[PDB]
Amino acid sequence: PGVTVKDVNQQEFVRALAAFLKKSGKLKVPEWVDTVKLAKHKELAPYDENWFYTRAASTARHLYLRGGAGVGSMTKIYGGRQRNGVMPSHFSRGSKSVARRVLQALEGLKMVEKDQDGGRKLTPQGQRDLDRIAGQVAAANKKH
Amino acid sequence: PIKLARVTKVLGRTGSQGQCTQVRVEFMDDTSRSIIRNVKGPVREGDVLTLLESEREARRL
């Protein structure tokens, strides 16, 4: 009977989860959170200055949906199209350092833990926290 | 005056490049008049056409 993450709109889920992680205040924000482009195919810095919270929320959601992912999988996932000048565009992965830092910060929250078969996955704390905030979002959207 | 008339039978593709169609055309208000017209576009039997000036008949070899 409990509403699942998969039963909830994903963008509102990411927004509410980022708000929750900013409210908790236990995330280890790096010093260079202001002075970095998220990948080499970007051109400007993100306007949303709390981009670390949204990226961590998206990473937690992705590791819920498909666990066992490492840093390279996160670089593949947030990769995009690089416009190579007057040359044809190509696909370029995301920056490895941002993926490593969001993974290690979510791990320091006790939200995310390593596994024997590979990279990172969710804790039971992570699963029930996502279920609780998904219940909150479903109450705020479906019941209104 | 604006006139309306049904296609009865298509005579065949006409024009230098086959861009027109010569066709048998009869009115609905008086189903006695019967004229030859040439048209641009795909036509079949049962199509009805809007004729601006319904006096002269089309003529192409």
């Binding site: 010093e31 260079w32 202001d34 002075t35 051109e43 400007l44 810095a45 306007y47 200055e49 | -």
Partner: protein, 127 residues
């Protein structure tokens, strides 16, 4: 909202005219030697809202932006972010904006000419 009573249509920054009817992160980009990315980081280091227009900044924020502009390293702007990192004559991490860029290009080309390397001779044969 509406116009404030102190909206400055044209600013005079580093002997450069700045159109006040523009966003601040691109009005700073209008200065030579500053692009979009460097303007964005210098305005974020000054703790200034980027939704807010350039032409009605007070003088204090303009002066603090300028003091970050000619002094990047003192405000945690990274070393790899600068225009001229290792200057050939006196190696120091610097950021020349208005007249320093034009000048330093001029003596760069002059140094290339005076040693008669291929690049200087070719570029001054180009005109």
């Amino acid at each position: 909202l509406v116009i404030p009573e102190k909206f400055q249509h044209i600013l005079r920054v580093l002997n450069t005219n700045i159109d006040g009817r523009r966003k601040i992160a691109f009005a700073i980009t209008a200065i030579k030697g500053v692009g979009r990315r460097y303007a964005h980081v210098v305005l974020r280091k000054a703790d200034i809202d980027l939704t807010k227009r350039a032409g009605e900044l007070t003088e204090d924020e303009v002066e603090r932006v300028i003091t970050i502009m000619q002094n990047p390293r003192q405000y945690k702007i990274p070393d790899w972010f600068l225009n001229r990192q290792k200057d050939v004559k006196d190696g120091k991490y610097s950021q020349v904006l208005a007249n320093g860029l034009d000048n330093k290009l001029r003596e760069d080309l002059e140094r290339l000419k005076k040693i008669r390397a291929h690049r200087g001779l070719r570029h001054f044969w180009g005109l």
